[PDB]
Ligand SMILES: Nc1nc2c(ncn2[C@@H]2O[C@H](CO)[C@@H](O)[C@H]2OP(=O)(O)O)c(=O)[nH]1
């Protein structure tokens with residue numbers, strides 16, 4: 001079973017932890033990857049009720065199991081905060097335009 005289901009993509013907690021670790025490291029070093037410059041601030045326009053405090057940052061999580069290194073980020077993202085706490089896993093899949101919905 002999936003710990004997180006983003007549309008058709010299935011993620012385990014280990015997938016999320018691995019992605020989050022990579023994104024947080026880049027954040028701490030002040031570096032980015034990809035044309036969209038990940039990780040970058042997640043403004044939470046959607047208004048999700050995260051259990052952890054902001055600021056929030058988003059980083060792609062890939063269905064391939066590999067850590068994002070550039071190129072197309074796909075539709076899924078892990079959101080973490082300044083303390084490297086997981087806020088949630090969200091996706092553009094099933095959402096209009098560039099909006100996000102939470103993975104289940
Ligand atoms: N929907 C949404 N997009 C955000 C938010 N913060 C940053 N963005 C980024 O701004 C772009 C245009 O709104 C979105 O595609 C998204 O980039 P990502 O695709 O990199 O997540 C947010 O809180 N909500």
Ligand SMILES: [Ca+2]
Nearest residue numbers: 011012015065
């Ligand atoms: Ca996996």
